[PDB]
């Protein structure tokens, strides 16, 4: 298996730990080996091995930001196939059932605001801007990939309604003021319950991290938990103007296509079908 193949590395990084006891979350680009208090990122393709140095450097930069919560901190890096040991953020995700409690929502939203605030502030820092990437015309490049790859798979009516969504992207300004997680899903935000009310342990999965528009992350929160909750976060954070709502609404439309676009490339039939549900 994957554990047997890397037993030499695991014996070094995790001395005495039985490899077959561990779990391996086979992600998209990396193969993270889940240990008790840490994980071990390994590149699947050769291209991922080339980016791992800067990825490791990026993760260290994120570790020195005041986000009001933990992030995977680099512990070790080398070769054998390059590797990166990151700290395991404790706590589990939060289901939408919990937000039905009003007092919980206040707390959860407030800590989300503190997180997004820290990300916003960090984007101003010159050091952070140099460390992290900031692609120009990511949406127009995205639109071209969608038009190339997904349009053939879509219906006539689906292409119309898709083109309207891609048309909206050109209206958006190319903002690069804040740090953007890029995939701020519910399962990527970990929480501490059973002590008091939920307390944000930390965020994980920063593979789509960049300097960009913070609406992207707000949209992700809205995709996870919905209208009423996002409104609460916007009102507390003071991001409830029309232009911000427009940017959020516009970006959220692409989430279905982004799922399909990725699934198309890595031959995921279940994801591709789900992403194209409306578009055919």
């Amino acid at each position: 298996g994957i554990l047997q193949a890397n037993r030499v590395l695991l014996s070094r990084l995790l001395p005495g730990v039985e490899p077959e006891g561990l779990t391996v979350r086979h992600g998209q680009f990396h193969q993270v080996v889940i240990a008790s208090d840490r994980v071990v990122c390994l590149p699947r393709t050769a291209a991922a091995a080339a980016r791992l140095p800067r990825r490791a450097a990026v993760m260290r930069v994120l570790a020195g930001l005041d986000l009001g919560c933990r992030t995977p901190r680099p512990l070790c890096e080398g070769s054998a196939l390059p590797f990166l040991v990151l700290s395991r953020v404790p706590g589990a995700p939060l289901e939408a059932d919990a937000l039905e409690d009003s007092k919980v929502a206040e707390v959860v939203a407030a800590q989300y605001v503190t997180l997004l605030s820290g990300l916003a502030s960090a984007g101003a820092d010159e050091k952070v801007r140099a460390a992290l990437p900031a692609p120009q015309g990511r949406w127009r490049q995205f639109a071209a990939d969608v038009r190339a790859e997904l349009f053939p798979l879509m219906s006539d009516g689906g292409c119309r309604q898709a083109e309207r969504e891609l048309a909206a992207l050109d209206s958006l300004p190319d903002i690069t003021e804040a740090v953007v997680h890029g995939n701020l899903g519910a399962e990527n935000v970990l929480w501490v319950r059973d002590d008091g009310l939920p307390r944000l342990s930390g965020v994980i999965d920063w593979d789509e991290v960049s300097i960009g528009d913070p609406a992207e992350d707000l949209a992700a929160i809205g995709a996870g938990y919905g209208k009423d909750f996002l409104d609460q976060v916007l009102t507390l954070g003071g991001w409830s103007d029309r232009r911000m709502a427009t940017r959020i609404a516009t970006i959220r439309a692409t989430f279905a296509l982004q799922q399909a676009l990725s699934a198309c490339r890595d031959g995921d039939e279940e994801e591709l079908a789900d992403g194209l549900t409306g578009y055919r």
Binding site: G185, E208, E216, A219, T254, F255, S262
Partner: peptide
Amino acid sequence: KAXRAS
């Protein structure tokens, strides 16, 4: 993998 983006 997923509608949040992944």
